[PDB]
């Protein structure tokens, strides 16, 4: 079987991954990375009667709930966020707390459903 033969693989022109490019959740990752800041928050406290900018972040998950109509591909969505701004995660332990908060992000929407979401065959450097 010479290499001249066609690869024999077709149908890979499309993949849920392409749906990840539609993610673009800079405000969501900022709601998780900023929260773990600890020192970045706890300032300019506002009365509950007044609205808080953080309350606008919640809309994020709410959007992935019925806005972007995400699905089991959420993993590729959350993984994209970290990869969207994790190049500095190894710099500190932010990967920890961020992981705890990042674990709640997928809860505010309740994407849970599939027995397993992450695959051991594939993974990222940040984790």
Swiss-Prot record:
Disulfide bonds: 16-73, 28-60, 61-109, 75-117, 86-126
Source taxon at top rank: Eukaryota
Up-regulation conditions: Repressed by water stress.
Tissue: Expressed in seeds. Not expressed in roots, pegs (budding ovaries) or leaves.
UniProt GO MF annotations: IgE binding; nutrient reservoir activity
Gene3D superfamilies assigned to the protein according to its UniProt record, in alphabetical order: Plant lipid-transfer and hydrophobic proteins
Presence of keyword NAD: no
InterPro entries in the record: Bifun_inhib/LTP/seed_sf (IPR036312), Bifunc_inhib/LTP/seed_store (IPR016140), Napin/2SS/CON (IPR000617)
Keyword set, alphabetical order: Allergen, Disulfide bond, IgE-binding protein, Seed storage protein, Signal, Storage protein
PANTHER family recorded: 2S SEED STORAGE PROTEIN 1-RELATED (PTHR35496:SF20)
Family affiliation: Belongs to the 2S seed storage albumins family.
Record protein name field: Conglutin
Native source species: Arachis hypogaea (Peanut)
């Amino acid at each position: 079987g010479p290499m001249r033969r066609e690869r024999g693989r077709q149908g890979d022109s499309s993949s849920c991954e392409r749906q990840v490019d539609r993610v673009n959740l800079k405000p969501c990752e900022q709601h998780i990375m900023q929260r773990i800041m600890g020192e970045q928050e706890q300032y300019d406290s506002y009365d509950i009667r007044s609205t808080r900018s953080s309350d606008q972040q919640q809309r994020c998950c709410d959007e992935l709930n019925e806005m972007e109509n995400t699905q089991g591909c959420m993993c590729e969505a959350l993984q994209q966020i970290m990869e969207n701004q994790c190049d500095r995660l190894q710099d500190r332990q932010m990967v920890q707390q961020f992981k705890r908060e990042l674990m709640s992000l997928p809860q505010q929407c309740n994407f849970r459903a599939p027995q397993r979401c992450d695959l051991d065959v594939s993974g990222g450097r940040c984790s």
